[PDB]
Point group: D2
Chain length 436, copies 4
């Protein structure tokens, strides 16, 4: 296992690619302009990264459209797209230490999380999506005997994927896995705060067998190249994760341009409901402490006095550190009777009944996730069912396989990352009704 000094040496010895990627080749932005990618670990200059704009969006989309029309990927046999997507995931694992280090240097994530969670989780989304391709079935309708009615799914064509900086590679792979597996061409626009891993995997896709033009990567700013993609008249679908404010802007851009499909995932405050009969109060307390560090806590009154000190002590475990130290669990970054505030940073809502907890938890713009802690069978299922959240966790927190659609109710977003339902965002339904 690598020490902090090993990672420091590896960091110094990286050669970091900063260019955009279009039609199988790294390329500067048409303007030649760049922005400084500055590490939050120690302020070092990681790379001068291409600052793409509308001219680059245009070239990336032309490349994407032409590749989609060629059929090189969009009409490739499903079992061969499966194999390619699994090789793609394998190349992420084969380059895991470099990718984890790029991620940590780019935006400060602890090297243990980059290497232990994000990069394997990104690989897993690519390979799971590939595995699923030829396990999917479309539909034959119940029709009279002189009719054959097919209901099939087809790729939308050109997909723009705009992702934030919190899980740069893993969020990108959650879009890329299903979007590529269904046969679309993808123009990926990583956050200006974390472009490096997206830039790096562009080349691994080619290595895996993804044809030129099928995955283009445009680093740069949201207000320049992101807006240009959202407004582009030949982009069929934009998928977005990020802030509610930008999510709303994309609907506006869609309406102002070509009525493209828009799928949104927008954070929102996620409640944590702890009942007095939770089976493992220490687990609930660890959960609550985790959410304050790298959420809205609701606690039953009969357990509040006992429970809050456990949250406080558990919070002590989270300590900033150098992200290059494997022991660090929080990145120490550098410049580039119902409601109470208990400590400096402990905000707590108290309830007496489950109905109170549900009404307070649902009193929100919503609503990406929620956790419920109770040993009682009826209260667990009825509370989970009453919460307006795309993900509800019961007696655990942040649980969820690749078999888990991740998304929100209302201003938290629309559509769902992950699962077989993830594919639906990237395909169109067609009805073929054949007279025999």
């Amino acid at each position: 296992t690598l020490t902090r000094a090993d990672w420091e040496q590896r960091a110094q010895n990286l050669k970091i690619e900063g260019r955009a990627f279009i039609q199988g080749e790294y390329t500067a932005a048409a303007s030649g302009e760049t922005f400084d990618c500055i590490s939050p670990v120690d302020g070092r200059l990681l790379a001068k990264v291409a600052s793409c704009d509308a001219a680059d969006a245009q070239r990336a989309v032309e490349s994407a459209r032409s590749a989609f029309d060629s059929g090189a990927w969009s009409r490739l046999a499903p079992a061969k797209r499966k194999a390619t997507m699994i090789r793609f995931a394998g190349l992420l694992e084969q380059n895991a230490e470099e990718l984890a280090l790029l991620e940590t240097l780019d935006m400060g994530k602890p090297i243990s999380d980059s290497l232990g969670v994000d990069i394997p989780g990104g690989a897993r989304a690519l390979s799971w999506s590939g595995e699923a391709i030829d396990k999917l079935y479309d539909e034959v309708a119940a029709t009279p005997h002189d009719q054959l009615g097919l209901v099939t799914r087809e790729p939308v064509g050109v997909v723009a994927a705009i992702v934030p900086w919190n899980f740069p590679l893993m969020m990108a792979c959650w879009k890329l896995g299903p979007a590529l597996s269904t046969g679309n061409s993808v123009v990926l626009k990583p956050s200006e705060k974390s472009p490096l891993t997206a830039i790096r995997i562009a080349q691994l896709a080619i290595e895996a067998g993804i044809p030129a033009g099928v995955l283009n990567v445009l680093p740069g700013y949201g207000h320049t190249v992101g807006k240009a993609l959202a407004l582009h008249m030949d982009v069929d679908t934009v998928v977005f994760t990020g802030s509610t404010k930008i999510a709303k802007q994309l609907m506006i851009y869609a309406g102002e341009s070509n009525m493209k499909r828009v799928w949104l995932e927008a954070g929102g405050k996620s409640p944590n409901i702890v009942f007095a009969d939770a089976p493992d109060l220490q687990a609930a307390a660890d959960s609550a402490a985790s959410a304050i560090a790298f959420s809205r806590l609701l606690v039953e009154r009969s357990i509040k006095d006992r429970f809050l000190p456990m949250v406080i002590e558990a919070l002590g475990t989270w300590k900033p550190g150098n992200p290059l130290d494997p022991a660090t669990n929080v990145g120490a970054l550098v410049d580039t009777a119902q409601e109470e505030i208990f400590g400096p940073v402990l905000s707590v809502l108290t309830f007496d009944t489950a109905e109170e907890a549900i009404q307070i938890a649902n009193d929100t713009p919503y609503g990406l996730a929620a956790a419920v802690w109770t040993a009682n069978l009826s209260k667990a299922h009825l509370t989970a069912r009453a919460l307006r959240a795309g993900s509800v966790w019961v007696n655990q927190y942040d649980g969820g396989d690749m078999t888990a659609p991740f998304g929100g109710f209302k201003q938290s977003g629309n559509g769902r990352d992950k699962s077989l339902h993830a594919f639906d965002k990237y395909t169109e339904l067609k009805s073929t009704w054949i007279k025999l």
Copy 2:
């Protein structure tokens, strides 16, 4: 079988309701204002219809939300929502002659179409969606043995349904069937050119057992009450059929308001692609004549175009109240030639739209490969305007997003939830 004179007598003897419907009662608009519902058959004044605005949108949405939160419909057992939807459909059928006559007087559709197609088709959309409710299953994920992973569907809450004048009742039922069946409250906003059947069925829904506030109906103009629903901060989903220009405006209104989900069916074309080996050229000709772009293989064009010209002659405008009329009186077809299936596909797909297409060929490969290559939500092969309730209907590209009919229509009215339970 009723004669024209029978229908003119029934038309004269109708009492026509014009009010909005909120929380189980017909009501004037808050302002007291109305607009004149004028028959394109006659010029006769059918009714003074409530001209709702933002204040009525507010009351309809508050009513819808409180009905949703009450669970009276949203948490009613699936089998009981099935029975109510089926009774609702039975009440359209039981009142079919009055509803077809309202439809024909309201916007000029021939009475034989209103009675024979639209009212039965709208009733069928309600009963079929009702029948489906308790046949749907959600999902149990494959998980480790100490986990239960459930992926379920839940109603979004309050649905605004905005529909045009071309198929007032049936297009409304295409929305209402799946939207109500999944437990939502619906605020229905019919076109200003055809509000009457939507107003009338609001009372039939109550008679069937739909609770007060679950189906509210707001007649009025698109730019007043329609805009106010698209912009409303407590409407979870808007579903729409109509023009591309308005469909785009709804996305903008959603972004300006609460990020509500927007499902659009916009304008589209139904091009016919007629190959020389079409099994029944007369059927292809009738299809082209019921209308726009006609793609014709060069070798049969000389023989085929006279067939469509003759068929175009069978459509005679007449009095919409005459059972013999097939086009209502009231108050250019482009020929492209091709030599290969590849050209026909490229020509057909050269469009911002993509709603439907019909393909005519007796060849196995050509039929399936051409249907695959067309960017249309519906492809009909060796027939036109085909499909029933099992066939989802909608558009690629700027013809909209989402699908009406089939089990997939339900998806637009529900939200996915993943519940991960540690055991």
Copy 3:
């Protein structure tokens, strides 16, 4: 609401049909023989019922096969088979008082159960399966672009349905609903102890629009006409509910004849596992009393056993024609103690059978983990005899194979086909 005297008057005034039904007509058995259908209520002779044998099996199967090959039902549009099945169910409901009375006279079931549970439950099985028909989709495989891969379901052809006397009509409808709805012809063989309702509904099927020959009914003995259907070389599938011993014999008969598919629901037990934290001990006690093995957690056993003894007293035998009767007059519960959920599971699973089980606990993990570990086709948690038409019913191990009710019941009556089309 009818009184006992009302029911005794209706029982006296019935005219009871006793003939077999083949190709749209009631008929004597080929031999002319009958057996005496004696009421366990009274000893009264209800009817002299046709005693069919191998020759009648032959004629019923020839009729079924020719009806199947004609396509009159097997190739009728799914929506038309839906409407007929729903009308068929409506005819059971329209004749519910006569059918419940036949059921009660035939095998002694209390009239309030016959009228209140069995006839509605049988009708519901017919209408629910009918409603499902056109909501089912087959599959399009993921294939290269020059291939179309279809995986579809087709009716097996001729189905023999053999049912016992405990729920004559409803168990018959559990078979008929899915078997007819998928387009098969069915030869129904009711128990010799309860042939009357099956005989009677054969005419209702025709009245609903089921074609002649699609539903044939052969009363008689298991060892004559039943054996002859199990051994018949042109019966594609036999479905059965009854004893383990006969269920095993049917597999043998299938192997001795034409390798027909065999679907069995055999004997099973409904053990109750009552934990100390059960949310409602009285409900658990009533469950145990409606009866066999009772697993009880040691700490509540002293308090719980008096509750089941008291509840056992509420079951009083009486005249089956008395609406107040809950056990028909006509003509040992084993207590196991456990300390942990692991013992309770091991005790419960220590059985050759595995049809059903009920588990009583308010604990989330314990409920789900115990239900997972039980080898039973149905597990009820904090209720007993639960589930509706959406819940498949059947057994693990020697309680049989396959499931009645739910969309999965359809699988037993269809065959999969893969069609791989080169384009």
Copy 4:
């Protein structure tokens, strides 16, 4: 590419395992008895193979039951069973040349078919089944609000898989893939004519991570150990491919013992319907010739004179040869107006209408497969639909991905190998109805 001489040398240099495999170890039969596995290539003695009987069935089933009850495989997380099953497939590919050579020596299959079709096809069934495990979903019923209704699938427990000698490894993998992926323990009984590859992969399963006891292999005779498994009172399910006569016997054995589930796949004569408007008459003729060599031919009258000589010439291409020669396409083995017979070996039925063709093709005990050749859209779909066969091929022959359920109508069998439907044979449905 290896020459015939390379294969001859490899054949001589093999060390061939002949023992049975129970509870993670090779073992002789309890009796110590063996039978001679004699190569049909040149009569050489390949190995003395354990001749298992009822005592061995009993020990294998006890091992299988105990392993299933332990949960080591049956309650292993689905994503981990996926990984193990994919490693299993990888070990087949890693040992492909040895496995292909064992198959060719064991029963005479051409070495090019063993190496090019059977071994990769067997690996593909194992890995596809593993890929599918965590893409499967059970069901949540539509219930009143105070009810949770689950409809789930569970492994049956102990599965006996009895396979013939025609595709010894590939047929075994068609059962093993889904049976193991769903978590059952499997007792595999290969044909007495081809036991070697089944014996050899038993060890590769352990290497892959399949726990001891989960896959036991019992070589020996049908009338001894096969019957003992079919009669065993603790086997939950027998799956069988082979002759109609033995298929019927297994139903009898099931009824005489414990009412175990029986799933059968029994050959039957498969028709080949050639219409005058077939798009590629040469392809249809190659198809018909292939079926006579390593079926029932139906030909439209208006094309018969033109078509039959193409069949005859195409049949000339199939020539027996030494199975160890890569050029060989047929193993040359050694001892261990409607109906016409045209040549020595060309039986042909002539029809005038599609209805005639359908009625003649369906006039059968059935009915495993069928092929239709016509360019006409309506006739293709309507004929395919009218045929009573588990597999219908249109304008091709023996087509079919792993996404293809393979099985028969009526005396051709019940249930279907391959596809997602393949899993249903190996699981039980349970309904859990929870009052809330």
